[PDB]
Each structure stands twice: as C-alpha cells, then as structure tokens.
C-alpha cells in the first residue's frame, strides 16, 4: 500500500474513457456489420444517414481479459477499502503496475463477469439524489445466468430473490430505512436498454428482464418455478452502443450459441417520484457501457510521474 492520501473520482475517471474507446476499436475489427447507419447533419435539421456496407464475417466474438499497465512517466494508483464510494479521498491507496484482468463485457441492465464486491453488496452513484444518475450495484456474490441462442436464459430464482433483497436492503440504506423498496421493469426506451441486452457468440441477445425486476417489498414469485427463465431474442438489426445509429449483423449459423456468465452487478435507476411517500421505484438501466467500465475501474486512477 502507498503511504499517502489522494482523491479519486470513478465518475470522472479518465481510464474509463480510455478503455471504452479501446473496447470500441476492439469491436471494429471483430464484429463488423453488413450495414451501419449513422446520423449526418450539417445542423440544418435535415439529416442524411451515412450508410456503410462491409463484409459480415461470422466470428464467435469471445472477449479476452484486458490489463492496463502504466507505460512510463505514468503510474496507476489503486484504492483499497471494503466499501469505497469511488468518489473521494482514499486512505489505503497503493501504486500498481497493471489493473486486474478485466473482461470487457458489453451489456445493459446486468453486468456480466465483472468483479465481485469483497465485503458486501455496494452501490455507487455519482449522486443518489439525482434520479437521472445510474446507480451501479456491485454484487458480493454473483448469480450464474445461462443464455442460449435457443431463445432464453435461466437464472436461479433463489439466488435472484436473495440478491434483490441484499440490494433492496442496501438501497434503503441510502435513501432512508423507513422507505419501501420496489423493483419495476424498464420504463421505456430502446430495445437494448429495455431488456437485458448483451452479446454472446457474436449474437446480440435481447432478454426480457421483467421477471428479474418486478419485485415488491412484500410478495414473492416461486410458485411452480425453480429457475427464472428470461425469454431472450437474438436481433440482427440493432442500435449501436458505440455511436448513435443502427447496424445490421448477419443471421446466426453455428449449430449452437451458449453463454454462462456471472451476474456480478447491476445498473439500476430509481425514478424521481418528486419527493413522494417512501416508495422508491428502481428499474433496470444502463446502455452507457462506460458505467460498465467504471464499475471495474472505480478504484483506479492513472497519474503522471513526479
């Protein structure tokens, strides 16, 4: 550990933007659409769409862990604490060569294969007061989730029920104990944000996460169900996360696509409610892959040599 006190701000961390831009370029030479459409305006309202048609090679895009080592004239500083807001003065900081192996998983609503919370479930937010700022949840115990191009994902109803609890409890432990915690599905928006979207085998899965976010701080949902089955769908025409615009990928082909990932975290986003009675409603969120990266770099910060 480094014997000094420094400031950290994962919400304004620059490595996030440095990885994000990398992960995008890690996408332009691995997953290339058959056609990519992107807004093109002079400002005069009228906006032509810039079209691009390239080969559409079916590649089973399988993410490789990524390290981030400071070159020279630069040093990475890691924060150490069982519960770090990731936005303030860190006491147990410590210089490191490369950040832990991170598997740049691009997804929405659920953070897959990320890094678990050592102690307990932690939830960071650039401002919990602002019903506009994504709440990044960090699970201390991942929940396996298996998706298949066959059309769905299975999740443990047990583990997910617990998780919502040990999350619902960490929420009120920030918005007011004497406050009811509820979970509802997406409010609306793009398919990629409304469902738990992500990529598996180069196939863009779109799983309906209603059964994962319709939890009332009162009842249950395990009648005749051992596992939660999200009705997933693979799309060819998708909205790009790298930049405003659609993109069409070629249909599936491999006799079988399969994924078994660790739900290591979520991206929630409680609704304003305009100071109404203690009844905070949290819904799935994300779509801004940087929050993802953040959830992984929340305790890092590269700095110039002295």
């Amino acid at each position, epitope marked *: 550990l480094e014997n000094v006190t420094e400031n950290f701000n994962m919400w304004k961390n620059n490595m996030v933007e440095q990885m994000h831009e990398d992960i995008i370029s890690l996408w332009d030479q691995s997953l290339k659409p*058959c*056609v990519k*459409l992107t807004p093109l305006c002079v400002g005069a309202g009228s906006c032509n*769409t810039s*079209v691009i*048609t*390239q*080969a*559409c090679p079916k590649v089973s895009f399988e993410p490789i862990p990524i390290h981030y080592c400071a070159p020279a004239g630069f040093a990475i500083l890691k924060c150490n604490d069982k519960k770090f807001n990731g936005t303030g003065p860190c006491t147990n900081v410590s210089t490191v060569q490369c950040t832990h192996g991170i598997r740049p998983v691009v997804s929405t609503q659920l953070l897959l294969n990320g890094s678990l919370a050592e102690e307990e479930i932690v939830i960071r937010s650039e401002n919990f007061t602002n019903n506009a700022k994504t709440i990044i949840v960090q699970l201390n115990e991942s929940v396996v989730i298996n998706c298949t191009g066959a059309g769905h994902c299975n999740l443990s109803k047990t583990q997910w029920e617990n998780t919502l609890e040990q999350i619902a409890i960490k929420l009120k432990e920030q918005f007011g104990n004497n406050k009811t915690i509820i979970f509802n599905p997406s409010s609306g928006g793009d*398919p990629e944000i409304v469902t738990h979207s992500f990529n598996c085998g180069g196939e863009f899965f*779109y799983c309906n996460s209603t059964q994962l976010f319709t939890w009332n701080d009162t009842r249950k949902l395990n009648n005749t169900g051992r596992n939660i089955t999200l009705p997933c*769908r*693979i*799309k*060819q*025409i*998708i909205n790009m996360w790298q930049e405003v615009g*659609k993109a*069409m990928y*070629a*249909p599936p082909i491999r006799g079988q696509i399969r994924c078994s990932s660790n739900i290591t975290g979520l991206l929630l986003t409680r609704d304003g409610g305009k100071d109404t009675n203690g009844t905070e409603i949290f819904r799935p969120g994300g779509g801004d892959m940087r929050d993802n990266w953040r959830s992984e770099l929340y305790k890092y910060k590269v700095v110039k040599i002295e």
Partner: antibody
Amino acid sequence: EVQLVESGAEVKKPGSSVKVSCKASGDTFIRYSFTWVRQAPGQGLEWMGRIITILDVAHYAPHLQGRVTITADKSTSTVYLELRNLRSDDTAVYFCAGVYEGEADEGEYDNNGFLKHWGQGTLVTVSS
Amino acid sequence: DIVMTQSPATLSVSPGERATLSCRASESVSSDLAWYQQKPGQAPRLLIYGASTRATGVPARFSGSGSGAEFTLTISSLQSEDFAVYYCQQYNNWPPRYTFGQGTRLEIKR
C-alpha cells in the same frame, strides 16, 4: 403472402430517366426486402439491385451503379426503380421481386438474396 | 464478379422422363443458390433456394442439389407444365452483387 403490383409499361427515349412503381400488398411491407430484376427481350435475368426496405438501404449492380436507384415509400407501401440516362439496351421487362425477411420490425432479419414474390413485370422501351 | 454458367444451354427431353440441369459458378457461392422457372411471358418462379430447399408450394419432382460451385436442379418425371427456361441465382457475396445464370430451355424432344 404478398401480391406485387407494378406501374405501367413506359416508352422512354435515349438519355432519359424512368421510374417504375411496385405496390406491395397482402402483408407487412417492412418485413420484405425488394429487388428489381430486369430482362431484355430474348435475354435473361440481370440483377439490378435490392432494397433492405426497413433499413432504407439499397445496394446495386456494378454495371448500373450511378444510373439506378431503388427507394420505398413505407407510407403508401410502394417500391420504386429509377434508371437514368436510358440507353437502347436498357430496353427490357423490369421485374419487381420481393422476399420475406422475418420479424424485421423486431430486429430479426434473414437478409435473403433469392426472390419469392415477383411482380407482373413492367416493360420499358428505350428507343429513339 | 461471380459468373454463373448453366452448361446445358438447351435440353430436349420428353414428358415423364428425368431432366437434369447444371449451374456452374465462378468462385464458391456456398449454398446461397436459388433456382427459378420462367414461362414465356411470365415473371420467374422461385423453385429452389439455399441450393437444396424447395419454395413453399412446389412439386417434389424438382430436386435441388449442390453446394460450393456445383449445383443441380434435377427433375424426376418431368411434366407438361414443367416446360420453361430455368435460372440459377447466386446470392452469396456481400455487399450484394447477385448474378443470374444465362439459362437453360427445357424443351420437349419429339
């Protein structure tokens, strides 16, 4: 199960431009990708291009790039094929052809090259 | 740039008999190959697609065979109505640059 209807046969003169219509009915328009296939008398099919309707993108035949365009009016449910700078050889029966693509209005898209549904065909005579 | 050549420019055969057509392709077109049938003065007719799969509502006598650059639309007991020119369509490259065969007339030999 769609039924494609085309505009009337037109007699255009050299160096001009012609626009053939193609009414698509009987199913979900945006779920189809339409292709124009021309055929000169005595000659055989020649791929003119295809419009991935829903996306409003269309790719064309090498020997036509520049002088041809394919557009679709989702409102009226029509597809159009425009050839400009008409030559005599362009004289042919221009066919309108389409294929189902899948729940394209839902992100699903097979992007099929073959053509399951064909038009009645529109003849265009480009001569002086 | 793909050339699709239908070797049998013309095939004279009699009803009930078995007629065979062969479409030759430049480079490999995998299985993105369809077959069409055209009666004089009619829009083509999608017979086979994906090389070996008949289009909805088509006589089982039409056999779609092949893969790569060698396809074959073989027909068992040819029928009176089976007289027409046959066309193979290549639609495997992308960007889209589909090409048609030059044809084959399935004329009745008498």
